[PDB]
Ligand binder design. Structure first.
Ligand SMILES: CCCCCCCCCCCCCCCCCC(=O)OC[C@H](COP(=O)([O-])OCC(O)COP(=O)([O-])OC[C@@H](COC(=O)CCCCCCCCCCCCCCCCC)OC(=O)CCCCCCCCCCCCCCCCC)OC(=O)CCCCCCCCCCCCCCCCC
Ligand SMILES: CCCCCCCCCCCCCCCCCC(=O)OC[C@H](COP(=O)([O-])OCC[N+](C)(C)C)OC(=O)CCCCCCCCCCCCCCCCC
Ligand SMILES: CCCCCCCCCCCCCCCCCC(=O)OC[C@H](COP(=O)([O-])OCC[N+](C)(C)C)OC(=O)CCCCCCCCCCCCCCCCC
Ligand SMILES: CCCCCCCCCCCCCCCCCCCC(=O)O[C@H](COC(=O)CCCCCCCCCCCCCC)COP(=O)(O)OCCN
Ligand code: HEC
Ligand code: HEC
Ligand SMILES: CCCCCCCCCCCCO[C@@H]1O[C@H](CO)[C@@H](O[C@H]2O[C@H](CO)[C@@H](O)[C@H](O)[C@H]2O)[C@H](O)[C@H]1O
Ligand SMILES: CCCCCCCCCCCCO[C@@H]1O[C@H](CO)[C@@H](O[C@H]2O[C@H](CO)[C@@H](O)[C@H](O)[C@H]2O)[C@H](O)[C@H]1O
Lengths: 438, 273, 124, 59, 402, 55, 124
């Protein structure tokens, strides 16, 4: 039984949340922000990611070099990432180096220089990043998947932004972005590991007290997405492995079906030929794929946002003449969530998840990421007892009902990359979303 | 299993083809055979009578029946040839079985010239048998009544099918009920479809199975007895004998083959330890 | 039928004293009349192999056993087509009639049947 | 022209209510109507055609 | 971690406040003990195959009912088999480890169809990184055998089922087995290990055939899939100061989109190359390595010169600031190693299987600028420098150039 | 593998009427092939039927 | 007919001043009426490729030329099925209508025809 997550507010509306662990000697403090690429329009798309680079380029006090040294001398490291809906900046350190790290984080967020010289320098670095993501196939696949599923909508934009924007981002629009978005009511200061809650609250009162509040404070995790069934094909005959994603519109963080969607996802599950145990897994699709060598791997996913989600599967295969079989078998396994699933599969998946949701949290950074994610998406940390009750409430009837409204005979977004000649056209793929025999 | 199952349908098509061809002569056997075989359809409940009138195209076997059987008898051999080709295409995935029942993948021969020249021997043996019947005894296998023109009034002494259908006719006579008899007669052909299930042996074929070989001998001779009983008069003691042979026919598929094949499995294992 | 079935039933018989007393001598005569040894086969050479399970068990034979099986099948095929029987050393002696394949197929089937059972497990 | 994340313009063709049940239902009504007439036409064709085999007017 | 003994097996456990328990069996069976090359990798991959009580398939299907996870790895020193599960399911996992050590049926089909193919995919995935290859090659040059044996099974030298069965007869024995339980009640674990591992052979301590000998030289692994260079210096007397020196010289950045303030990090400026100093203590010898990967062989060469200069410059003088920065970076590195379950298990495993008491992160020694400069001076003046080049080897530096 | 590809008979049908890879730009003059197949089927059905009544 | 034939005959015409004066303007209008440029094709995209010789010449194209050919064919196929024509930059301008393939096929055929000749050589 894990220690209780303590939560406090400041006056401005900044949330402080902590989970102490007297068994460890390191601590992860950081700032989770309910803001990301989705907050840009089409003209300043790429700003949030641009800022992440400049946050570490020097502040009004410490220069770039001083910043580097200060962190080196702390002993730990700083890390940051910007997603579509969330920005994080954290610092892993030693137990007694926590006040230094909070001070550095507060500095880079509130008091960054954003000097024209450094804007101009990063503008090349980020330009080069556009031609090197090209290698990270999973990311290429999922970025096209968002682009097409949420065609011409904010969620459909990339995080990097277009080349044209990177050339025209000014310090003014950077400043404007972080002034509008990085507000106290959108931010959570999180500490996990060897942190005292009351010590962290004092550090927050010392460094984050002069944060602007937004004019209209909505609750944390507050958002209209209109999914487009569609396909992107990026055929490349020179690649040896095909990467394919298929997704339907999934569920948001606060959907009533959030846990039902997780159980459904767990019924299909994951597979990887390189892992020893995978040939033995209970999942039907796993068995079909492994026996027939249809794929190197597949990974079911259920990605959530504030007002929508994507639920689907990501497949990789070298079997380029049997891609049709791989996709056929995968969609027919989805059909069975609507037609055939019983207490047998549902109870097996529930058992696997009851542990899985707890197992994931195995280090201070994972704990901090869990506190931060939950606080910025749900507005509270959900206790393991509540999660256990929500999972227990998922029945076979619930899964069937969900699949019949979400999956059965629905439009898909489909992205294929590599030697995908044998992936059939949209109609034949989409026709596998139903069974004529049912 | 697939070439075998298609094979059973080829056999049904051959029966229908040959039945209709026999009617085209329109002798006494032609007419009276068509009458009694087509009347078996009257057993189908509710719609049986309507179906018979629809087949006949009238109220009895007559000109409409004859003309439609001509058209169908012309067509059926083409259908038969297609199914014959399908069963071969299905077989081509496994290749031919062989008299040892083991794999032949280890030692293959080209179909030509070896089987081409071996097929010539039986072609010439066949042609010799053909010649002896066609040129020297052309009427031995036939019924003299078919040289009498069809007469709906006079009923021939004995209405029997051609010899090759006789075992199924004996099976039909064995069941007293009309519908019962028809079901049994059809089952006698369709029961071939369950051999793949009821044969429980771990070994393919009988070359090495002494008990199965004896049972096969009895089964074959019983099928010949059924044939003979199909052309006797319905009189004692052939009535009871017909029933016993019919029981034996069905019990081969349903009881004996499953028993014997299970036991031989055990004897092979224990006997070689 | 499965080799598993055959082997289990045989073991029930070999356990019962009465049963073994009456079955074992019959099985020995059955095998003598079967006459597969007169073609230089071992019993296990006759088991139907055109099955996924049996293909897997055959792949798992040690190379030596595998090469010798191929020779027995070819030699037997040659006796069959010539209408001759084995003579001398080609006749399989009862001591050479070893169940070389049975352990392999029993393991393949063990897993196949466990898989079927576990595909129907119900959390209690 | 260059970025493959900028989906080409499909606004001339995209329906605003594309994810609604009403939208699917309409297209299945068309498919169903076509199946319905094909079934009714097949029935009429088969019935009229096979009736040739029933007793003719001279009988 | 309260060290105790249960039925001849050393058991170390630390109770915690989490629903997640990690039980790890640490075996004295790493590559330095390998009878034949690659056997320790194979034995690791043969864990949780068919046992006599329970099939591999049945184990995996039941582990999915508990939602447990299985992690295995081989080092030069140990094989580690870790399971992660919910606290309450501890008895199941103890018994499963008992079955693996007592009753593994090492069947030839498992080796051909299951174990060997997976071991080969494991290796190919690691070698995708040229820096991994370079540091493996450097150990091979430096030690030849023992520590110089490959950790992983390779295609050129095949392991047989007799090899694996023999090695397992030595390794799977009370003398070579330690159990480490993170977030496991220590009294409960002792009771369970005491009943489950009672019937395990006693066996004897597995030993390295032959003494560790140090050698200098060059290795030139020609690949087409990336470029890297390791500059290693074999250490005859492993000392804790080399940790501080590794962390000082550094190489990785402590901040996104930055180069870093470490000497080796500063050696990469103007190049798309990365660098990393590491020190490997193996008890009786050590290896101090500096690995540089990059896309350009010209840039790698350029950095490699600066890197050896940096080491020489350190041998001259370290500032007080720099020495404190080294203490901080080193304490932190020790802490996160004791946290990560993979490394944690092996740390206490070493304490239990050898007798090297673990150095708590709170007891990491502070080295003065004098002691650090002295350590760097010994390295710059080594008689046996090793260089492993990987990639376009015709364009990478040689030992005599450095 | 999908049954339509695995089974040899189904696979022959499959290769002609279902998976058969066609150019994506055939115009309506490529439709006469199937019309000819339709006429041939109509001629067979009507022809066999006329044969049942013709002398 | 062979590309070699076509190329040689064309060169005879281009040599003769009179012939070129009357043929070249006709050829230019022929190509205008042909209208393959309205589908964004280059002339050489239309040459029949289901011959061993042409398969060989296509394999010998530089990769860039090869990738661009594939795109032109796909784009033209999409215009065809849509019953649209190319507009703007998709229309092949006369300066872009380059004989990218002709040198490759002429070399492939050169060897094929030399081979045929030399297969009929007679020592004198
Ligand atoms: C008989 C049994 C009945 C079944 C009907 C089958 C007939 C279908 C068919 O093949 O023809 C339709 C056919 C439509 O086919 P399509 O797929 O639209 O185009 C085929 C050509 O590429 C179309 O050529 P195009 O794109 O150049 O358009 C040409 C066409 C315009 O095509 C149309 O769309 C009409 O108009 C004409 O050529 C008319 C000539 C000028 C008369 C004044 O119409 C024509 O092509 C008629 C022109 C023939 C001369
Ligand atoms: C009449 C009764 C048939 C008994 C046959 C028993 C086996 C026998 O001796 O046959 C010789 C042979 C024995 O051949 P074999 O292949 O078993 O043995 C060859 C020799 N050894 C053992 C060395 C390999 O059997 C046949 O060739 C049987 C063919 C069966 C054809 C039956 C036609 C009947 C039609 C009824 C259809 C319904
Ligand atoms: C010539 C005979 C025509 C008979 C068709 C009559 C009814 C079948 C039908 O319309 O098919 C619709 C159905 C369904 O069309 P569908 O395949 O587009 O619909 C599937 C999706 N749901 C179930 C969600 C609507 O097609 C078939 O089942 C195939 C049979 C056609 C022949
Ligand atoms: C003449 C009568 C016309 C055919 C009657 C069938 C009704 C068609 C409607 C049914 C339908 O649309 O469903 C499809 C059935 O079509 C089919 O499966 C068949 C598609 C069209 C049939 C005709 C094919 C060519 C006709 C020309 C004749 C050929 C010459 C030989 C005489 C399913 O299919 P889906 O994949 O769209 O389903 C998507 C989901 N599962
Ligand atoms: C017996 C099977 C049969 C088949 C198959 C058949 N027909 Fe006929 N066909 C007939 C009969 C019987 C007649 C004569 C009765 C009649 O004229 O309608 C006939 C008559 C015709 C006539 C003359 C029609 C008239 O009355 O003016 C034509 C033309 C003809 N067939 C063409 C074809 C063509 C073309 C095909 C196929 C390609 C074909 N037939 C297939 C039986 C057949
Ligand atoms: C009831 C079953 C059945 C019927 C009826 C049948 N076949 Fe066969 N036929 C088979 C089977 C089963 C095989 C595969 C036998 C094998 O080689 O082991 C076969 C194989 C063959 C072969 C391969 C050579 C051979 O004799 O083994 C030919 C040729 C053949 N059949 C022709 C025909 C023809 C022609 C007809 C009728 C017109 C026909 N068959 C009717 C079941 C049948
Ligand atoms: C597996 C398929 C099922 C078996 C198929 C059944 C085959 C034929 C049965 C019905 C055939 C005769 O059935 C009969 O059909 C004809 C039309 O064809 C109908 O007749 C009706 O329409 C025709 C014209 O369309 C008119 O000339 C007539 O006055 C009118 O009554 C009869 O109302 C119906 O009783
Ligand atoms: C038109 C009515 C529908 C019935 C089909 C028509 C009957 C004619 C079929 C027999 C002729 C042989 O048909 C031949 O079969 C094989 C497999 O089936 C096809 O083979 C093709 O498909 C299979 C998979 O679909 C691939 O293994 C193969 O690489 C490819 O060439 C041939 O391209 C076709 O020429």
């Amino acid at each position: 039984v894990s220690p209780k997550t303590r939560t406090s507010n400041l006056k401005n509306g900044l949330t402080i949340a902590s989970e102490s662990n007297p068994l460890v000697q390191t601590a992860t403090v950081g700032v989770w922000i309910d803001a990301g690429s989705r907050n840009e329009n089409a003209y300043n798309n790429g700003t949030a990611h641009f800022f992440e680079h400049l946050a570490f380029k020097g502040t009004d006090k410490r220069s770039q070099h001083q910043l580097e040294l200060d962190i080196e001398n702390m002993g730990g490291h700083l890390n940051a990432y910007t997603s579509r809906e969330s920005t994080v900046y954290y610092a892993k350190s030693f137990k007694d180096d926590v006040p230094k790290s909070v001070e550095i984080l507060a500095d880079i967020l509130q008091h960054s220089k954003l000097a024209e010289s450094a804007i101009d320098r990063e503008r090349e670095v980020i330009t080069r990043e556009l031609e090197e993501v090209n290698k990270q196939y999973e990311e290429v696949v999922f970025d096209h998947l968002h682009a097409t599923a949420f065609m011409n909508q904010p969620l459909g934009r990339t995080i990097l932004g277009p080349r044209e924007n990177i050339q025209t981002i000014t310090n003014t629009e950077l400043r404007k972005f972080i002034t509008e978005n990085y507000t106290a009511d959108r931010m959570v200061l999180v500490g996990a590991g060897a942190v005292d809650h009351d010590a962290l609250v004092e550090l927050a009162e010392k460094y984050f007290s002069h944060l602007p509040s937004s004019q209209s404070p909505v609750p944390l995790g507050t958002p209209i997405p209109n999914f487009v069934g569609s396909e992107v094909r990026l055929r490349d005959d020179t690649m040896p492995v095909a990467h394919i994603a298929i997704a339907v519109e999934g569920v948001s963080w606060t959907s009533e079906d959030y846990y039902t969607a997780l159980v459904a996802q767990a019924i299909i599950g994951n597979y990887d030929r390189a892992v020893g145990t995978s040939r033995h897994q209970g999942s039907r699709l796993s068995n079909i794929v492994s026996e027939n060598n249809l794929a190197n791997s597949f990974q079911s996913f259920s990605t959530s946002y504030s007002d929508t989600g994507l639920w689907g599967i990501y497949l990789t295969s070298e079997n380029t003449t049997q891609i049709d079989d791989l996709v056929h078998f995968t969609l027919k396994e989805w059909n069975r969530l609507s037609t055939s699933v019983s207490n047998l599969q549902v109870e097996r998946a529930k058992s696997q998840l009851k542990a899985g949701l707890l197992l994931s949290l195995d280090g201070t950074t994972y704990v901090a990421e869990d506190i931060g994610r939950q606080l910025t998406t749900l507005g509270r940390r959900v206790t393991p007892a509540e999660v256990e009750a929500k999972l227990e409430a998922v029945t076979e009837h619930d899964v069937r009902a969900w699949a019949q409204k979400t999956l059965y005979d629905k439009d898909i977004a489909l992205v294929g990359l590599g030697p995908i000649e044998g992936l059939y056209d949209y109609n034949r793929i989409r026709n596998d979303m139903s069974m004529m025999r049912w | 299993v697939l070439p075998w199952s298609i094979g059973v349908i080829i056999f049904l098509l051959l029966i229908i083809t040959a039945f209709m061809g026999y009617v085209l002569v329109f002798g006494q056997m032609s007419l009276w055979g068509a009458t009694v075989i087509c009347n078996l359809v009257s057993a189908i409940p509710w719609l049986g009578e309507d179906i018979v009138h629809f087949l006949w195209g009238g109220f009895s076997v007559g000109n409409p029946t004859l003309q439609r059987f001509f058209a169908l008898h012309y067509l059926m051999p083409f259908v038969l040839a297609v199914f014959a080709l399908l069963h071969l295409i299905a077989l081509h995935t496994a290749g031919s079985s062989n008299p040892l029942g083991i794999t032949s993948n280890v030692d293959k021969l080209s179909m030509h010239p070896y089987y081409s020249f071996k097929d010539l021997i039986t072609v010439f043996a066949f042609l010799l048998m053909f010649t002896l019947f066609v040129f020297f005894s052309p009427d031995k296998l036939g019924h003299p009544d078919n040289y009498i023109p069809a007469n709906p009034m006079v009923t021939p002494a004995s209405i029997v099918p051609e010899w090759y259908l006789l075992p199924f006719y004996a099976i039909l006579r064995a069941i007293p009920d009309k519908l019962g008899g028809v079901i049994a007669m059809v089952a006698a052909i369709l029961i071939l479809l369950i051999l793949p299930i009821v044969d429980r042996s771990i070994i393919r074929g009988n070359a090495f199975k002494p008990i199965s070989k004896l049972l096969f001998g009895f089964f074959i001779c019983n099928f010949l007895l059924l044939g003979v009983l199909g052309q006797v008069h319905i009189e004692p003691p052939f009535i009871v004998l017909g029933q016993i042979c019919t029981i034996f026919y069905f019990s081969y598929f349903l009881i004996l083959l499953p028993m014997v094949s299970t036991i031989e499995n055990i004897f092979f294992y224990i006997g070689s330890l | 039928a499965s080799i598993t079935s055959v082997v289990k039933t045989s073991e029930l018989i070999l356990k019962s004293p009465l049963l073994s007393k009456i079955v074992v001598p019959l099985a020995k005569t059955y095998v003598k009349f079967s006459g597969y040894r007169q073609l230089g086969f071992k019993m296990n050479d006759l088991i139907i192999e055109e099955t996924p399970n049996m293909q897997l068990a055959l792949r798992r034979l040690p190379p030596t056993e595998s090469y010798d099986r191929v020779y027995r099948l070819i030699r037997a095929t040659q006796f069959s087509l010539s209408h001759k029987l084995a003579t001398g050393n080609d006749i399989t002696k009862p001591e050479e009639d070893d169940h070389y394949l049975i352990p392999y197929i029993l393991d393949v089937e063990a897993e196949a049947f466990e898989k079927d059972a576990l595909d129907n497990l119900e959390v209690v | 022209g260059k970025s493959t994340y900028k989906i080409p313009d499909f606004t001339p063709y995209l329906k605003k209510d594309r994810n609604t049940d009403a939208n699917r239902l309409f297209s299945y009504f068309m498919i169903g109507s076509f199946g319905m007439l094909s079934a009714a036409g097949a029935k009429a064709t088969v019935q009229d055609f096979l009736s040739n085999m029933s007793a003719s007017a001279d009988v | 971690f309260s060290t105790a003994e249960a039925a001849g097996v050393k058991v170390a456990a630390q109770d915690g406040q989490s629903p997640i328990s990690d039980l790890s069996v640490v075996l004295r069976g790493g590559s330095r003990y390998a009878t034949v090359p690659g056997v320790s990798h194979i034995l690791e991959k043969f864990a949780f195959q068919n046992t006599v009580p329970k099939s591999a398939l049945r184990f995996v299907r039941e582990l999915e009912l508990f939602g447990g996870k299985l992690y295995t790895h081989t080092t030069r020193e140990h094989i580690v088999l870790r399971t992660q599960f919910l606290k309450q399911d501890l008895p199941y996992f103890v018994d499963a480890f008992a079955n693996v050590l007592k009753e593994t049926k090492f069947q030839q089909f498992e080796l051909t169809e299951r174990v060997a193919p997976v071991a080969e995919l494991d290796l190919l995935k690691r070698e995708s990184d040229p820096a991994f290859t370079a540091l493996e090659a450097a150990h091979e040059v430096a030690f030849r055998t023992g520590l110089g044996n490959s950790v992983y099974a390779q295609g050129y030298s095949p392991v047989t089922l007799e090899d694996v069965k023999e090695f397992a007869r030595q390794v799977y024995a009370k003398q070579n087995v330690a159990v480490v339980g993170n977030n496991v009640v220590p009294a409960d674990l002792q009771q369970l290990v005491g009943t489950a591992f009672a019937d395990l052979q006693e066996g004897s301590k597995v030993t390295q055939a032959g003494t560790t000998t140090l050698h200098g030289g060059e290795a030139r692994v020609r690949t087409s899939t990336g470029n890297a260079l390791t500059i290693a210096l074999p250490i005859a007397e492993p000392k804790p100061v080399y940790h501080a020196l590794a962390s000082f010289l550094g190489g990785p950045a402590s901040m996104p989109w930055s180069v870093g303030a470490s000497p080796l990090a500063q050696a990469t400026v103007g190049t798309h190359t990365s660098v990393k100093a590491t020190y490997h203590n193996y008890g009786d010898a050590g290896l101090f390595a500096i690995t540089i990967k990059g896309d350009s062989p010209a840039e790698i060469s350029q950095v490699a010169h600066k890197a050896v200069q940096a080491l020489k410059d350190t041998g001259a003088e370290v500032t007080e600031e720099q020495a404190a920065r080294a203490y901080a970076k080193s304490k932190f590195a020790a802490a996160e190693a004791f946290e990560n379950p993979d490394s944690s298990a092996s740390v206490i495993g070493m304490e239990l299987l050898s007798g090297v008491s673990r150095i708590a992160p709170e007891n990491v020694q502070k080295f003065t600028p004098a002691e650090l400069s002295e350590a760097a001076a010994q390295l710059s003046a080594s008689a046996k420098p090793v260089v492993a080049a990987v990639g376009q080897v015709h364009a990478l530096p040689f030992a005599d150039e450095l | 593998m999908a049954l339509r590809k695995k089974n040899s008979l189904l696979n022959m049908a499959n290769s002609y009427v279902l998976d058969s890879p066609q150019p994506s730009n055939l115009n309506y003059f490529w439709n006469f092939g199937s019309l000819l197949a339709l006429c041939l089927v109509i001629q067979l059905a009507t022809g066999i039927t006329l044969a049942m009544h013709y002398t």
